[PDB]
Every structure is written in structure tokens, then in C-alpha cells.
A paper describes a structure:
Encapsulins are a class of BMCs characterised by their conserved subunit (Enc), which self-assembles to encapsulate enzymatically active cargoes and can remain porous to cargo substrates. The overall structure of Enc subunits across species with different T numbers is conserved and consists of a peripheral domain (P-domain), an axial domain (A-domain), and an extension loop (E-loop). T = 1 encapsulins of Mycobacterium tuberculosis, the causative agent of tuberculosis, and the closely related Mycobacterium marinum, are known to encapsulate the DyP as a core cargo with iron storage ferritin protein (BfrB)28 and FolB as possible secondary cargoes. In vitro cryo-electron microscopy (EM) single-particle analysis of the Mycobacterium tuberculosis encapsulin was used to obtain three structures of the encapsulin shell in intermediate states, as well as a 2.3 Å structure of the fully assembled shell.
To study the structure of the encapsulin shell at near-atomic resolution, we overexpressed and isolated M. tuberculosis encapsulin from E. coli, which has 92.5% sequence identity (97% sequence similarity) with M. marinum. We used 89,072 particles which were found to be in the fully assembled state, yielding a 2.3 Å structure of the complete M. tuberculosis encapsulin shell. The encapsulin shell forms a T = 1 icosahedron and has an inner diameter of 19 nm and outer diameter of 23 nm, measured along a fivefold symmetry axis. The icosahedral assembly of 60 copies of Enctb can be described to consist of 12 pentamers, 20 trimers, or 30 dimers. The dimers are formed by the interaction of E-loops from Enctb subunits of two neighbouring faces, forming a tight interaction. The M. tuberculosis encapsulin shell has multiple different pores; single pores are present in the centres of each pentamer (9 Å diameter) and trimer (6 Å diameter) and two pores are present at the interface between two Enctb subunits within the pentamer (9 Å and 5 Å diameter). We did not find a clear pore at the points of twofold symmetry. The diameter of the central fivefold pore is relatively large compared to the reported pore size of other species, such as 6.8 Å in M. smegmatis, and 8 Å in M. hassiacum. Overall, the encapsulin shell structure of M. tuberculosis is similar to T = 1 from other species, with some species-specific variations, such as the relatively large fivefold pore diameter and the rotation of the distal section of the E-loop. A notable difference compared to M. hassiacum is the absence of a disulphide bridge between Cys134 and Cys254 in the M. tuberculosis encapsulin.
Residue numbers in the entry:
A (entry chain G), B (entry chain FB), C (entry chain A): 1 to 265
Write the structure that this text describes.
Amino acid sequence: MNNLYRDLAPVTEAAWAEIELEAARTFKRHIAGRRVVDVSDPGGPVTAAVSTGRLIDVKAPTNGVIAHLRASKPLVRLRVPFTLSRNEIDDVERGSKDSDWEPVKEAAKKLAFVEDRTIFEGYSAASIEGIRSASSNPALTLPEDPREIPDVISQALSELRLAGVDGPYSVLLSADVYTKVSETSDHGYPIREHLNRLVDGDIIWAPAIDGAFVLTTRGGDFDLQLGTDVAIGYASHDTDTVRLYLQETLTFLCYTAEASVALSH
Amino acid sequence: MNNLYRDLAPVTEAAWAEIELEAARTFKRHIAGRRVVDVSDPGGPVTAAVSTGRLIDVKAPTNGVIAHLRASKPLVRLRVPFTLSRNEIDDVERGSKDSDWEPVKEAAKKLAFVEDRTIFEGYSAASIEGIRSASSNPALTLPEDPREIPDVISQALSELRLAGVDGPYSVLLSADVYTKVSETSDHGYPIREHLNRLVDGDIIWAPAIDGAFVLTTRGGDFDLQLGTDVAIGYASHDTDTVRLYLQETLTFLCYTAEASVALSH
Amino acid sequence: MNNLYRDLAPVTEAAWAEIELEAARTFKRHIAGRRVVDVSDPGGPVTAAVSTGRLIDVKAPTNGVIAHLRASKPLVRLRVPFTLSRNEIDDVERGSKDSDWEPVKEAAKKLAFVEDRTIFEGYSAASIEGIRSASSNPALTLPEDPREIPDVISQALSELRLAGVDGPYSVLLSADVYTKVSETSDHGYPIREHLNRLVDGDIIWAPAIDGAFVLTTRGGDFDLQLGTDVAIGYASHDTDTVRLYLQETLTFLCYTAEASVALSH
């Protein structure tokens, strides 16, 4: 067995298939970051750091010796525990199709939110700079009126053009901004369609982020490194409940500072 | 023979083909529910209940015995009788093509209305909860002005997005609402086209329901179980008329509470 | 894995084989009901109800609609927990052949007693009518003197003959009555042999029932429906003991009211 200790969990095979399906579905729906960044293959469990290729000056060991430390970025392992009713698990073999997988959905939504907020806003404790912090283009303010959203977005499209950047540009919106441009309409279309006319990429719902992000998806600018992708593991169990977790280990690198514009309220 | 007792009816083969065609045509046109829900294969005449896979605590038979009843949902058989003129039946072999099949059309419309109102509004006596009652998303009020319909519908599309749900969304409208958004026009299109721009599913005419329903058609959320599909059976006859019926047996299950938004006036 | 969670139990393979053998042996010995009734194949875990083929009038959904609920009988799941010493389990691999399987035997005897008392005396909470309650033939009183038992039994054989019934008749006795007709002797034979001369079926020891039952085993009159047959499942464990259970899910149907005579004290 492995670190998931999956065979020790009192979960049947059919219940496991339903839990895997629910977690994978809810996660994909709430991920916006993997649609725009380069996603590496999983390095594996032993992978601990990503080389940046830079060098750090250290106090010379002896006379005439020049020493340099190799720089690297550590992976962070992110774990979201959740708790399942054993009655709901037992219902699945009897043929129930409405078993309560709400904790699985909440854990997948929380893991997806962490991953997206780590990619776009950073996680300083894990030495990850967000796309918002690593952007060299000027930051823009989103207006209160949703009918004035496409104007400011177009100004962001000016900045990537002034930065000398090609590629399909894509706009990612926070859930508040996505709702505002979805529910306001002008001439038989919502403002989301007006945003769709400005770019050759995609208007992407990004419920974890704040503000908005416009960026190129030409490739090679944004890199998500995975040691291991999302997995479900077993912690402990009692007569009534099974404690499990969702787990993934990653770091994020931004190679190109001028490939994005961040917007705030 | 079977329970339809079809060979006992004084109906010719050509008249039978015309009656089957008229009933099938009028039924499909008035069904909205089967276009969005999962429809099972017919179980057969012996099928009486659908297992839910849940358990019900019952008073222990003896000491040290733990007993549980298996929960299930009963099928309901729905029968709509109708009456045909025997002169109209006799006209068909002579080559008439305008035989009065209005009772067949009224029976098919009434059966379709029952089935759709059972799926969407429930039938408590048959222990069927409607989609409106089983929805966990908040209910919305449809405005008086049809030009304000697409706005509220978009708010419903917000709620399924806040519920974490994917899939093609589809909007079903009552006949009053469908007429209102069909006959009011803005900038060379009716409001029905404005609704069509908001979703990747279909604006569906649903004359049996009240209000409106927005829901995902990704699959596995809404399940119509059929023991036997719509069939035409023979009851009795006299010199002038033949009494027949339309008959179908079914139950409806909603597995996913957050996959729909109901709207009312 | 399944709902038994059998691989999670700290029970060795040899100990499992001994427990299965002990439970199966003790159960068969104490079952009288399966020797006389028709026993279906196991439906499976998803099976929840048995269709009776009857219809129940419900309040018409709308005008001109005739609705009927399909009638059915729910299965009941019967679980008898029991507790095993882990020292006795560990003794089996070392080669012990006297490991204490008394709790297994008591659980099998209790499960067999429940099943037989459910078949013959009913379980109202599970909507099961017993053979005694569903019999239309008159009930008889068993006399105090065992030498007068064969007389009354013969009167029961009159009643099935007056009911117009063929087939091998079989007599099932309670443990008190079986002991009384076993230990009293007349002319070199016990009274049990005198009972054996009256029928072409079998004198059957039925320790769970009260009184006596005489009935035909021609087939098609008494039907035991099994979703799942007797299985051993794992609940929980500590350093000293393993909690397991015996479990079976069933219902019982009596199709023929006049195929049996019940006797009481």
C-alpha cells in the first residue's frame, strides 16, 4: 500500500467510485488556473523542489574557494480533510443514488479555491509569488457599473499590447464580477458576451480570485509544477463516520512578468 | 392477449394505425419533461417499486435482533379514458382522412399534462416530490414585464453557478410565460431569442407547468422510472361508441437537490 | 470490498473457514421453514420490494385521470450481532480444534429462530402475515396427553382434505411437542413414528414455532423471497474481541390460504 492507506478505509468499491467521480467533477468545475497555465506532469512523491537555475553567494568555505548555493522552490502539500457518514457509504451498494457527498464537494471546492488563490494571489509562506504580485504591467481599477467593465478590460488589452506580447488572451473574472457581467444586459446580450467579443481566448469563471485577470495563453509564461495530483486518502474511522482527505502537492512559477494584467475593486 | 384487450375492440387495423399515430404525435409535442430528465427502459408489467437503497428502523422482532425495512418508491398507474365515435372509425377503411380524433388528442394532452405536472410539481399521494419542492436553490419571482424576464432567468443561472454545477442548462417555461416572451419583441427578436442567448441548452415549451424552471441536463440528476410506457387499451363498446384509454405507469426521482431553480409568479 | 467489510476484520483465513462452517451448520439444523416453503434465488442487494400485482386507489390527480398505486411488500434486513474472543481466533492457526464458537452458534440459532417465527407467526411491523394468521382452515387445540396427539393431527389432515388440496403433507412441531411425542412410547415406537405413519411428508422439528403446523408441500403455496441469503459481516474490533454479525434480508408471502392448519395449546 501507499500513504493514502486506501484499503484500510471502510469504503466499498462502488462508494469509492462515486466519491472519486464527485470529487473530480467538483474540482474541475472550480478550477480556472489549470486552463490558462502550463501544467507539468506529476514528478512523483519523492519530488521536493524545483530548480530555478539561479545561484546564491555564500561565505567562502576557505581561501580561494568560491561557493554558491543552488536556488530552488519548495513544493507545498495541501490537505483538506473531510468527514463522511458511514450510512451514506453503506447506501451505495444497496442501490442509492442520492448519497450525501456534500463533504466531498466542499473539500473539492476548498482545495480548488486554495490552488487557484495560490496561483493568482500567492502564498508567501510557501515562497510563491502570485500572478498579481509578479505582474509588471500596471494594475487597473474595475468600475462600479458593469456596463463600464468592457472599457477597462480593453485598457488591459492595451497594456499587453504595449508590453509586446502575442497569443490568445484570456479574461478570468471573480464570481462577483462574473455575476455582474452575466446579469446585466445590453441590446439582447449580457456584458459577458461583450467581453467575449474583445478576446480570442475565453471568458473564464474564477470564483476563488479577487478582481479580474487578463493574460496570454501562448505558453511558457506560467508554470504549475505538480509533485502529485489530487488524491483521496484515508485518515481514521469510527462506528458512524470515515475521516478522509483530499491532497495535492505543488508549486507555482511565473517566468514572464509582463504577460498579465491584474484588476481590483 | 394482454390487459389492453386490444383485439376485443371493434377497431380496424387502419383505424388503429391512425389512432396510434395521433396519440403518439400529440403526446410528444406536449411532453417537456422527458427532454431533460433521464428516462429508464420500461421495467415491465410486474415492476411495482423502485429501491431507494435506504433503511427504515423497525421495532426489534426479538432481543438482540436488529431489523430494518428496505425503503422504496411505488409506481403509479395513470389512466385517461376517452370515447370514440364508431362512425369515425368506420370512415377510415373507406378512405377518409379527416376522422375525428379529437378525443384521442385530448386524452394524449391530458396524460402528457399529468406526467409533466407530476415530474415538476409532484404528486404527494403517489409519494412523488416535484422538482420545485425538491430544489434546494432559492425560488425566484418572475416579473410582470416580459422584457425583465431574461434578467431574472440570469439570476437563476447565477444560483446553479453558486451551487457548483456544470452541464448544458435548459430553461422550461409555462405556456403563459412562453407566450409572453414569444409575442414581445426587442430589436428585431422576440425575448425567447434573448433567453436562447443565455444558455447552451434549449428554451423548452412546457404548457403543463407553472412558472419556469432552469436546470442542468448533464445527466444523472433527474430520473423518470417507467414500468410500462404509454399504451392504448380497450374498456368497453356500444353500437355508437368505443371507450378506450391511454395508460402509463411511472414514478419520478430527484437525486440532486441543487440542480434546478424554480420560478413562480 | 462490500458492506460486510470482511477484509477489515482481524480474522485469519482458517478462522474464517471455521466460523463459516459453524454458522452454516447451526443455521441449517435450526431451520424448518425452508424445508417446506418455496425459496427464491437471492435478488441481490438492490432488491427492496416484491410486487404483489395488486392496485391501490388514490385521489385522482386531475379531472378525468384515474390513478392507482402499485402494491408491494418491503424486504426486512435482519441482523444479529455477536462477539468473538480474539484469543480463540488466534488459536485456530496454531492448530486448535476446540475454539469457542458458542457466540457464532447462538447468533445462528437466534437468526434461524427469527426467520422461522417470521414465516410461521408473522412480523407485523414488516407487513408479513404468518402462516397461522393467513390460514383459512380452522385452528385446532393440541391435547395434554401426547398419546392423543396423532388423533388431533389426523383431524387437521381431514381439513386439508375438505379444503380440496393434494400433495405430500408435512407436520412441523414445536420443540415442546416434538419432545413430548418423542419421549412417550406406545408398543415399541414413540408417538413421532405414529405421526410418521399418517403422512407421506416428514415430521419436522421446528424449535422456533409454537404449537404445530400441518401443510402441503406441493409447491407454489408459500414463498420466501430473499434479497440476500445469510452472510457474516464485520462491525468493529478491540484488543480482545471482534464484533461481527449475521445478516439476511427477506420477506415472506403466503399465496394459498387453505394450504395449512395451525395448532395451539
